[PDB]
């Protein structure tokens, strides 16, 4: 029975490969060869935010494009105002090994997580004036790598026991569990319409998941080593990923194959974060060579370098109105660029 | 800015004040990372240290001679180990009167010879010596080890060989290795960890003035 099943798997894989190779009639660099380059783009630091005691691991913008949240090793979570460089909140944690944070879309809640395998949900707008815990969600086996919101009552989590989960908050119970990866899960990203989401999981493989039905729909391969970051193009039918072999790749979902590759011969380090711009014409990458790089998405060249950090860049993000870019690194400073 | 932003300035400054205090204490703390398969030995040593002072990650804190010490005491370990970049020493505990030695040597070789632990010293504890005394009184023939001396005799020739075996599998020298055979009195253990950390910090200090 084993031999027949293995042969069936091989035949199905060959069929999938043939189906993918059938429709590759054109190359993205062949239609974009007649388009004006964006020229040289340069950005000056406009604000500088200081106060952390150690390295910075994550950040997240808001929806009004004026408030920020950041997480550091010292067990601190800080809420900033970016127009006037003010501190609005300073929240102490319970476990000092933190690795991610998220900011709710209505503006009432935040999230935290790390090596304690628990996800903590915090309430901002109370009547006693303080900031107090609201939920401690538990049930995973290994550490957590990412967490994002859907509405004021639902969370998605990705954890390095090869698992993803959807949680309802009021009860505290799991609702659906996504399984099928072989290694640790490293990054996840949500769609604008809030019905599907993508995850990349440290085994040179990425997958698309249907949040409602409960099973995977498509899988993509191609990298040579593990995958560290992921995000959506701002229309819900494209995404782009970064690995630990100095290569970025742009994938499609309605054709089920890779489209482009961003790389250079002078780069040997890894990639720690990726984000898009508002029209899909700028892609931003943070590296370990002490810098951030600014690429044109549609022709794979270089357009800018944002220098100014003394250590590795860990996090970078873009607003919901398009005005700024925020970068945070291991020297415990945040910077805003326009 | 008028009549409310001014107030919103004061609040911000107050937060800074508290942070400025915290940095004055974090600078004084010594971090030590603890590993070992001897669950009983680890539990006993931890209980003794707690009595002196009085799963995920279980951090313990104590003080020896007015210096603050913190011990972390923890599948892809490569990403798990990136968060301990500011350590000073790794404390590795080994069972002796058991076998289980070749596996412990393999784990030692995997742990010490890593990229991210170049500037860290290794303290090595050998536990349960009384049972080893009993088991060397009733000699068990060494299966394969070339225990050239005193094989049908006391361990005092065996532990030289065991120390030599632990001394190898180290491909990056210029950071010392300290030995120990545990004793019931815990003052010895406290004194040993104190002096190992002090010697390491002095050797780091003499570099910055270009010795």
């Amino acid at each position, epitope marked *: 029975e084993l031999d027949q099943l293995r042969q069936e798997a091989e035949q199905l894989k060959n069929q999938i490969r043939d189906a993918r190779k059938a429709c590759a009639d054109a190359t993205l660099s062949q239609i974009t060869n007649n388009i004006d380059p964006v020229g040289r783009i340069q950005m000056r630091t406009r604000r500088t935010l200081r106060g952390h005691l150690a390295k910075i691991y994550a950040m997240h913008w808001g929806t009004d494009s004026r408030l920020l949240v950041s997480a550091s090793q010292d067990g601190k979570l800080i809420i900033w105002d970016s127009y006037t460089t003010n501190k609005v909140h300073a929240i102490p944690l319970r476990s000092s090994w933190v690795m991610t944070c998220a900011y709710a879309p209505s503006g009432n809640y935040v999230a935290c997580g790390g090596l304690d395998n628990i996800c903590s949900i915090y309430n901002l707008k109370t009547r006693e004036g303080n900031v107090r815990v609201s939920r401690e969600l538990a049930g995973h086996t290994g550490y957590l790598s990412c967490c994002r919101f859907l509405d004021d009552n639902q969370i998605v989590t990705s954890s390095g026991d090869t698992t993803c989960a959807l949680w309802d908050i009021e009860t505290g119970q799991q609702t659906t569990t996504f399984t099928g990866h072989t290694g640790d899960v490293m990054s996840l990203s949500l769609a604008p319409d809030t019905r599907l989401f993508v995850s990349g999981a440290c085994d040179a493989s990425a997958k698309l998941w249907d949040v409602r039905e409960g099973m995977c729909r498509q899988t993509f391969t191609g990298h040579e080593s593990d995958i560290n970051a992921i995000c959506f193009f701002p229309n819900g039918n494209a995404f782009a990923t970064g690995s630990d072999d100095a290569t970025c790749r742009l994938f499609d979902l309605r054709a089920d194959q890779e489209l482009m590759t961003y790389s250079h011969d002078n780069i040997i380090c890894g990639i720690t974060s990726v984000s898009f711009s508002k029209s899909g014409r700028l892609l931003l990458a943070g590296y370990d060579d002490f810098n951030c790089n600014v690429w044109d998405a549609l022709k794979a060249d270089r357009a800018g370098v944002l220098a100014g950090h003394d250590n590795r860049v860990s996090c970078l993000g873009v607003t919901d109105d398009g005005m700024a870019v925020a970068t945070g690194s291991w020297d415990s400073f945040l910077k805003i660029w326009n | 800015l008028s009549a409310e932003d001014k107030a919103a300035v*004061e609040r911000s400054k*107050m937060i800074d004040a508290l942070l400025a205090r915290e940095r004055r204490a974090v600078r004084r703390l010594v971090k030590i990372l603890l590993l070992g398969a001897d669950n009983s030995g680890k539990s006993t040593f931890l209980k003794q240290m707690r009595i002196i002072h009085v799963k995920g990650i279980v951090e313990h804190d104590f003080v020896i001679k007015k210096i603050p010490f913190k011990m972390v005491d923890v599948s892809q370990r490569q990403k798990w180990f990136q968060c301990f970049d500011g350590i000073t020493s790794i404390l590795f505990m080994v069972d002796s009167s058991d076998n289980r030695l070749v596996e412990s040597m393999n784990d030692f070789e995997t742990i010490v010879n890593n990229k991210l632990f170049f500037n860290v010293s290794i303290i090595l504890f050998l536990n349960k010596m009384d049972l080893l005394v009993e088991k060397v009184k009733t000699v068990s023939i060494k299966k394969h080890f070339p225990d050239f001396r005193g094989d049908p005799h006391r361990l005092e020739d065996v532990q030289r060989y065991l120390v030599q075996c632990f001394d190898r599998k180290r491909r990056n020298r210029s950071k010392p290795l300290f030995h120990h055979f545990t004793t019931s009195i815990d003052t010895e253990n406290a004194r040993f960890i104190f002096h190992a950390v002090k010697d390491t910090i002095l050797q780091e200090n003499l570099k910055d003035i270009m010795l």
Partner: single-chain antibody
Amino acid sequence: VQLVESGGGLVQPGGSRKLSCSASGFAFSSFGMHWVRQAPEKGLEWVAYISSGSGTIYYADTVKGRFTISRDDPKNTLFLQMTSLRSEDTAMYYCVRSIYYYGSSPFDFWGQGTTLTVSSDIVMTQATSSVPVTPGESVSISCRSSKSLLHSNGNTYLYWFLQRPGQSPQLLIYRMSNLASGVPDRFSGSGSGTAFTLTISRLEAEDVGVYYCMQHLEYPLTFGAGTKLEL
């Protein structure tokens, strides 16, 4: 969330007095505190202000040098110390909480007051004093200023409060457009520089009382006369 204050009474001229306020149910050390005043049958008048950290302190112009304010954080208690009392210091005194950061809603809780009896500034004016009403209809009120309240940063510092017959004020509109917590969604407010109007739709009983409009653009704070709805 509870403020209880004490100290009132009848005093002979001269003399001195010390009034106190006790908080219960919130984080007293992250809030600023105000003392406000109400005449026997007239509009409100602002008295004094102390802030977090015991730094900035502000007084008014008609009592300056005689009053003094203090706070005690570990026991959560405010003190007002007043000396050399005249015949014009006969009124009700009230305590008010406030907090200032991006998005906060100051003046969000008031106490129940105490009685005390004895044997340049921006001017704002109320439109009228009374309006005959009938349940089920719509109503609007207006008050007028004497300078622009629109600061350059995009704000507008005007407040609308309500006081029912026998109670303490409750916030209705802060910064000229926004709704306080715990209020029906039938209220609204609008205005242009130096002219403002509150609007109520689908009137209901227990909405009868006296309404008030305040400014906060720069110290000192100044009130209006007060408008009344008679059912």
